[PDB]
């Protein structure tokens, strides 16, 4: 893989291929039949015009499209059954977004099976991803606080039912045109419960991976919180720590070193500094819960939606 500056997730888990990294007919038909039962029946192509590809992903492509009867725009994510890194994770794309209506979760309208593709029709977030903004601009604390608040509200809800997102980074936060903020990328979730306390699968984007996850130890909803820390580093410093190193070299460093600090603490409020110390804590048991964090003084800094508007490409 290694070049560095790589944004693309990495998906394995709980086996030998996952150790290696310390330095079909029957199954398909069964899996397809199962999905078929889980999704909404029908074919969206019967009600949707104008499919144009607008985005590429680890698990598939995204197109915009037109509700024929209404003119309304929708986004459609299309995922191949044969082209998945861990086929079973596709259940997430259907189940999660459905089970979690919330002001900070992207809305899902419907899901269908089309050929050997899973298709999810979801609301179109006209604002774009956070990543764009972070890589081409400097958010002030008011705007940063507004972002974390939204993300944290969503995470509190997922973690309440022991759902781990496993892919928290700017590429996963989307925006409406009027400065509202939604979490978006539920492809790689896992769940914990009273009888499955932790998980051991190696899933995430290298630079954003919690260090206990890298150390192949059993993890929990805590990993998301470390990743959020890293996302804060993006919003401030523009890219994650060790971004320029190759993913594998970066991980090694994350496992071994002390939690990363911001480049320049001269201009950052102690309120924000203190916040981030609650996120990037190596020992998970010490690291803060989204529940707790929602009460942190820093988030009272959070500006309204209107204060996010100027950050978006249309207005730069
Ligand atoms: N509802 C939406 N509105 C606008 N843009 C979207 C929407 N959904 C996705 N996109 C854009 O298209 C891309 C689609 O990839 P997405 O992040 O949805 O999942 P993925 O990388 O395929 O897999 P995973 O969900 O497992 O991380 C994103 O990078 C995002 O910028
Ligand atoms: Mg994504």
Residue numbers in the entry: 175 to 197, 297 to 589
Tell me what the authors wrote about this structure, in their words.
PAK4 is a kinase with strong links to cellular transformation and cancer metastasis, as reviewed. We have shown that Cdc42 directly regulates PAK4 activity in mammalian cells through an auto-inhibitory domain (AID) that binds in a manner similar to pseudosubstrates. We have identified Inka1 as a potent vertebrate inhibitor of PAK4 with a Ki of ∼30 nM, which has a much higher affinity than the corresponding AID. The recombinant 38 amino acid ‘Inka box' (GST-iBox) is a potent of PAK4cat inhibitor in vitro but does not affect PAK1, suggesting Inka1 is a specific group II PAK30 inhibitor.
The C-terminal 31 amino acid of Inka1 (255–285) was able to induce crystals more efficiently than the Inka1 (166–203) when they are expressed as haemagglutinin (HA)-tagged proteins, although the iBox38 has a higher affinity in vitro. To confirm that these crystals indeed contain a 1:1 ratio of both components, we generated a single-chain Flag–iBox–PAK4cat construct as illustrated in Fig. 2c. To tackle the in-cellulo crystal structure of iBox–PAK4cat, intact monkey COS-7 cells that contained large single needle crystals (<5 μm in cross-section by 50–100 μm) were trypsinized to yield rounded cells in which large crystals could be easily observed (arrows). The X-ray structure of these in-cellulo crystals provided us with a number of important insights: under cellular conditions, PAK4cat adopts a typical ‘closed' active kinase conformation that includes ATP bound to two magnesium ions. As we expected, the activation (A) loop Ser474 is phosphorylated and the central region of the iBox is packed against the kinase through both main-chain and side-chain interactions. On the basis of these experiments, we hypothesize that Inka1 stabilizes the ATP-bound crystallization-competent conformation of the kinase domain by preventing ATP hydrolysis through binding tightly in the cleft between the N- and C-lobes. Inspection of the crystal packing revealed that the crystal is formed by only two types of contacts, both of which are between PAK4cat units. In the in-cellulo crystals one set of crystal contacts is formed by the interaction between neighbouring N-lobes that involves the two helices from one N-lobe interacting with the β-sheet of the adjacent N-lobe, an interaction area of 768 Å2. The second set of contacts lies at the threefold axis mediated by the PAK4cat C-lobes involving primarily hydrophobic residues; each C-lobe contributes 576 Å2 to this crystal contact. Remarkably, the iBox is not involved in crystal contacts and is exposed to the large 80-Å-diameter central solvent channels that run the length of the crystals.
